[PDB]
Structures are given as structure tokens and as C-alpha cells.
Amino acid sequence: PHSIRIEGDVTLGGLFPVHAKGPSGVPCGDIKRENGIHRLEAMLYALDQINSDPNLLPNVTLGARILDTCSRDTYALEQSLTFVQALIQKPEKVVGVIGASGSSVSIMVANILRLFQIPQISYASTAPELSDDRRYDFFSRVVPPDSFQAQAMVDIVKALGWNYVSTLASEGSYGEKGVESFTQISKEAGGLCIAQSVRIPTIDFDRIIKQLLDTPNSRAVVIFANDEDIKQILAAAKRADQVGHFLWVGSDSWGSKINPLHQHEDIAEGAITIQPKRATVEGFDAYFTSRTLENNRRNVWFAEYWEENFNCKKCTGQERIGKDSNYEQEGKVQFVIDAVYAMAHALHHMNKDLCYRGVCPEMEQAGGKKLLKYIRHVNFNGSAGTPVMFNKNGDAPGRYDIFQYQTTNTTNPGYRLIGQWTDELQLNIEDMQW
Amino acid sequence: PHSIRIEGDVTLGGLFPVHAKGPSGVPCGDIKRENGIHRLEAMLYALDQINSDPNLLPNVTLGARILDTCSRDTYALEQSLTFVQALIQKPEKVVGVIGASGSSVSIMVANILRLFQIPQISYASTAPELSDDRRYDFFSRVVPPDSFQAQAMVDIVKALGWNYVSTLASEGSYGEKGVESFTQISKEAGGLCIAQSVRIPTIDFDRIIKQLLDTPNSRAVVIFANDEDIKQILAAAKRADQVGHFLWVGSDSWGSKINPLHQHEDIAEGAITIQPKRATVEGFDAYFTSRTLENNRRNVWFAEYWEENFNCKKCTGQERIGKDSNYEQEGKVQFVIDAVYAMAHALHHMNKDLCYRGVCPEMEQAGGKKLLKYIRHVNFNGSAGTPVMFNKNGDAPGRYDIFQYQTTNTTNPGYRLIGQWTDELQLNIEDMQW
């Protein structure tokens, strides 16, 4: 068994990073809970609701064929061939694919499905590259791209009277190409000269702050760093005794997260962050925690996950998920589910239009060319009361929540909502405090 | 059974247009002998010789997995998935693919194999589009592209003092894009103004000559027409009483063929044609004719072919291929075989370099990235004593034989060798006669 297979009149493809990118030679690494098991389980949860929804796809049951990305393009590409296993001879009629976490993977997959006119909806890929609806015409993303985020950041930088900014992107996909967007959006706009562009892959981190203070005029540092990388730049900057000198503008990797802010409260004070308009799905919380080994067979990775989540093998007991006093939930679950809904709403819209009782031959063609024309024109309330739609390029419109960290008053300890970015920039300057 | 499968240590992919492009809805049409069965049988013949060759791949047997293109891109694309059937679980280790007749198909296939780093060698696709070694980096062609042919035609047009030419391309792939090359090669060069560009899909043909005589200054007509289309333009022009007015410059579709020249001897007189340096494989002629229904089981389409070649079902008798007094051989067989050799020579070169006794794990990786680097650096005598190689773009260098039809003397009735096009233009003007 190399996958999860739920049977249904129509089947939805799944690609999740269940396993981390293993070392050189070894294809799959350790299991990754929050990013692979959680997001995975979210789809299963989402499909459950759809299949139980009497108002949506009332006579057409949805199936699942979730597969392991293993955080590798080549791996997910060969893994995607099963979403085409029907085209050669119970046969699976894959109708669309819940696109992968990780753009470099997502592109690799958005290449076979493009050829088989299979439409795809990612939940995590934000690389501005994927917005080329010509190179990737069947791809669409339920998260917005980093370009929107960058324009938002340029908008905030522009509105505070900063024409000398600095960038600091974590070496990798998310970091580099996102900071590039900013660069280009800065070039195209007014030209808020970028002093330095530091690319970070704690001795080295102290050199980063040393290289940044090299341009002491560069007040503001635009950050596109991984979760710990922010924490390790801050600690480096506090060590550099640089409290309230730097003007942090953080990407969505930062957001309203207090974890990179522990002990780093003084230096981080007044940092600006853009978190996508997100909310936590209330129903799904009671679900994931419910899952035992005896009941949750569905998840063909759950015994593997169980041995890791609790660190065990002896492991006899199912009530164990109560042990999470060190480990909490996972964000971006709202998106996964929504992508699954974006598919289910499109299919249901395709049904009342072409069908008969249910799943007619007139639609059956596995022509996602018409379904793509439906996924794109899909505009409904999502799993958290946040609208779900796409532009002509297939990226979801970027609606954000600009936050700023404050410490002064006991009426202000934490992230304050400085403004929003629907597409026009909303930013309050009396509510701001550095 | 949907294919031919010969087992071997290493297996070579095959895609042939066994069946014509059926009507709207119906995927496969009738069988096509010369273009589907012949070319198909050539590969089988070619692989036989390689597998029997003690000097080439001496301990590594080559297998075959030939498949029906059915003259359709979508069809051949889904047909190509078997060349990847190994990547999910006797398993077949496909190493390369003998690329399809028909560029629009060839591109569609050069899209999955590109993704699976499977190298491919076409035998018939000449669309100048495929020379983009970036968009098609694993594709290579044992025939030259039409661009070479076009530059040759411009070279001949340039050397005869013609700055006013006309074009006439058959509506389709081969016709249009080839005539476009000429247009561009004319634009880039000296600018031999094109009067009209007639695209032909015998009342209509007489209108073609009517539209062509509209620019009576346009002495020369550059033709990229299908085999009968030339015959139907000539008959149209003779009816138009236009003997020795037009100056035909014919593409490789014309060549040294007397079939479009029956009764049309007077109008066609002096026409210039470019035939690729080709010769007929002596061994293979005695092979194809040998094939009976009882012996030749190998060919999973041969019973279907047999019922068509002789028009029968009653059909009891194997000695029947003697009935060919109306139907002869098939050209371009030299190319197919050569492509198969181009693969076998590359594999053998890859073996002595990486291997052990035979088919080592150190090469086994099905990484055609290194094999592509071998196919490209392959330079040997082909199946007809005509060198086989590739440029950095993967197209075989264009070596041609410029012919001209003559009728005057009984020492000259037929196509005379006016010159050659290795890359520098060779053209004799005393040997020419209109």
C-alpha cells in the first residue's frame, strides 16, 4: 500500500508532503506532522463534509487518492502518474488534484496534469512563477501569491516615508523569489532604493546583522525568512544591542506569531507583518484529536505518524493525543479544506448544468477544460467564513491583515491590527507604535 | 493486446502511425501500410540486426515496446504513459523512444519524456519548431528540419537571379510552418519579395493557378505540397495552358518522384526539387516481403494489415505479398532504422564507459540525461552508408540532392542531379535545362 484510496463516483487527487526530503540518495525522510499529516487529514475531513452535505453534490459521491509528495519534485511527478493510471488498461476517474505544498513540487506536477487537462488547486504554493496561466493554465491556488504580498509590503514601505529599504530572504524557494518580487515591485513603483539584499541560509547570524548595519541608513529590513530564521536574526540583533534601530517588515512566514518573539520582545517591538486573512476551522479541531489507531485506518500513514508524535513503537494506547502540552495545532488548514471545497463547488456547478440523476456520461469525459472554467468562476464562503475565489491567472485575491508588535502598555502587549490589504492599502498610523 | 512487446535487458520505445486519424469521435482510422506498418516493421528489422550484431551491444540485448500513434497527439500522449509504466508498482526499463511520425504528435510525446528525462529520436518530424533544445531538450531527429530545406531553397532562388518568388504550401503542419521558414529565411537574407502565399487545402486547383497568374511577374513558385497536391496543381496549370511559365521549386515531398509527373511531363519540365541524401536498405527489402501470417506473429497488427493489403478476410494464403504489381516499397525506411541505430550506438558507447559484464547498476538508473549526452555525440555510418549525426539542437545536419526534371534529349528524360546541399550550396547551371 503506497497511498490512501477512498472510492467514489468521482475521485479527487491528493499530494501532501507526508515525509520530509530525505538525505542524498534516500527519497523520503522523517514524517512531518503539521505540514504532512495535518494538511493530509484536513482533505479527508473536508471530503467527509462534502460527501455528507445534502445541498452539495447530493447524488455524486467524491472519492480520494491522496499520495506522498515526500517534499521532492521528481518524487511527486512519478507519484502523479497514478492520477492518469485510468488511461491505460476498479478504475479511478481522477477529476482534479489538490496541488502540492511547495511550489517547485507544484510546478513539476502542474506539468503532467497540464498535459492531461487535469485541473489542480494548490493550498500552499505561493511562488509568483505559477501565476503564468499560459505555462500553468490548469493550475490555480487557494492561497494568494507572494507578488500580492510584495506589493502590500511596498505599499506599507511607500506610505511610511521610506525610500531606503533592505531585504533579508531565507535561502530557498519561498525566500528568494518573493524578495525578487519586492525588488521588481520596488523598481516598477517609485524606486525605494534597496541598500543590501542579504540571503541567509548564530555566529553567521551575527555577521548578518554586521553586514546589515553596514548601511546604517537602511532603517527598514524587509524579511522573507523561515520560522526559526526570524528568531535567529532577532537574537543576533539584540546581541548587537540594536533595540529599536531596525525597522522589521515581515512576510506571511512571520505573521502574528509570538514563538519567534520569546525573549526577543524588545528588538522585535514595532515590527510590521502581513498575515493572510485566515481563521481556524472549528469543526476540524475536534476531528484530528479524535483519531485513534483502531478507528482511523483510513489514513495509511497514521501508524507511522503515531510512532513519531509520541516517540514510541512501546506504544499501547489510543487516548494518547492528549499529550500535546508541548505541541499544538497547525495553520493553513483553512486553505486545504477550502481548496477541496473549491473543487466540490465547481463539480456541483458542473453537474446541474450538464446532467439524468447523477454523474452523467455528458460530463463524464474527464475533460477538466470545462471544469477549469468552473473552478475559476467559483465564488463562495469558505471553511472559515472567508470568501474563496480566483482571478484570471488562477491566484486567489490577496486579502491580508497587517500587524505590528507592541510592548509599552499592558493594554497593548502583542500584535496589533495596524491595517488590512484587500487590494487597496489600509494602514493606521496613530495605532502604530515602535 | 494493445502493443508489440519484445523483451530485452533494455527496452526501446516505439510510436508509429499504424492507423490513420479516424473521423470525429473515432480515435483510430484505417491501417496505413507504407507509413505505419512499413516504418514499424523497419524498427523490428533494425533491432534484429543490433541484437544479432556481435560488435555492437555484445552482451546487452535490446527489447521493444512499439505503440500505435493512431496519427493523433492526445492518443500518442496517453500511449506514451507505458514508457513510464515501470515507475509505479515483468517490468520494462524503457531507455529511449523512437519518436513519432508527425511533429504535432512528436511534440506531444516530447513533453512527457522530457519530464521523465527519457531521450527520444524521431525519424520523420521535420517541423522547425522542434529544434528548440530548450523547450525540447531530450528530442532529437534523424531527419533534418525544414529550416535547412528552406535555406537551401532560398540559396537556389538567390543564385538564379530571382528576387520575386511565390509560395504554395499544403494546408497542414508540414506545409505551413515550412513555407514560413522560407518566408523568414527570405526576410533575413536578401529579401526576395514574396508576391503571394497561396495555402491549398480540381475546380479549386484551377482557381489556385488563376490566383497565381495574378502576379505574372512571380516566375518561380516555391512548393511545400502533399504528394497528390503537386499532381493536382500541375494538372491545373497544364489546363491553364501554362507550359514553361511557372518555375517550380519543390520541397522534399516532391523530390525525385515521377508519380506526380505522369502526363504532367511538359509543365513540370525543369522543376527544382530537394531530396534528402537517402538510399534504400538492401537487406530490409528481402525482409518485409518475407513476412507471412504464420511466421510473423511478432507484429501484433499484421493480421489487420494482411486483410487490408490484399483486401480480404476470404484470405487463405501466406505467399500473397507477391501481389504488389500495383504497390511498391516505402521511402524513409533508411531513417527509422538509422534512428534505432543512433540509439543502439549511444547505448553501446554508454556501456564500455560505465560498466562488469553487461547492463551494470552504475548505468541502470534510466537517466537518459547522460544517454542524451551520448545520442548527441553519436557519429557513425548509417543503414545506407549515409553518415548519422546531430547538431547541438539535436537536428541531423541537412545533406540534400537538388534535382531538376528534363525532357528534351532521350539522354535526359527524368530527374537530373543539379547539385547538392551539404550546408554550402552546390548548383550546376550548364546541367540545367527548362
UniProtKB/Swiss-Prot annotation, chains A, B:
Family, similarity comment: Belongs to the G-protein coupled receptor 3 family.
Upper classification of the organism: Eukaryota, Metazoa, Chordata, Craniata, Vertebrata
Name this protein carries in UniProt: Metabotropic glutamate receptor 7
Residue positions the entry lists as glycosylated: N59, N381, N409
Organism per entry: Rattus norvegicus (Rat)
Stated role: G-protein coupled receptor activated by glutamate that regulates axon outgrowth through the MAPK-cAMP-PKA signaling pathway during neuronal development. Ligand binding causes a conformation change that triggers signaling via guanine nucleotide-binding proteins (G proteins) and modulates the activity of downstream effectors, such as adenylate cyclase that it inhibits.
Disulfide bridges in this chain: C28-C70, C312-C315, C355-C360
Topological domains, Extracellular: 1-434
Subunit-structure text: Homodimer. Interacts with PICK1.
Tissue expression notes: Widely distributed throughout the brain.
Parent-protein start and end of this portion: 40 to 511 of 915
Binding site residues for L-glutamate: S103, A124, S125, T126, Y174, D252, K332
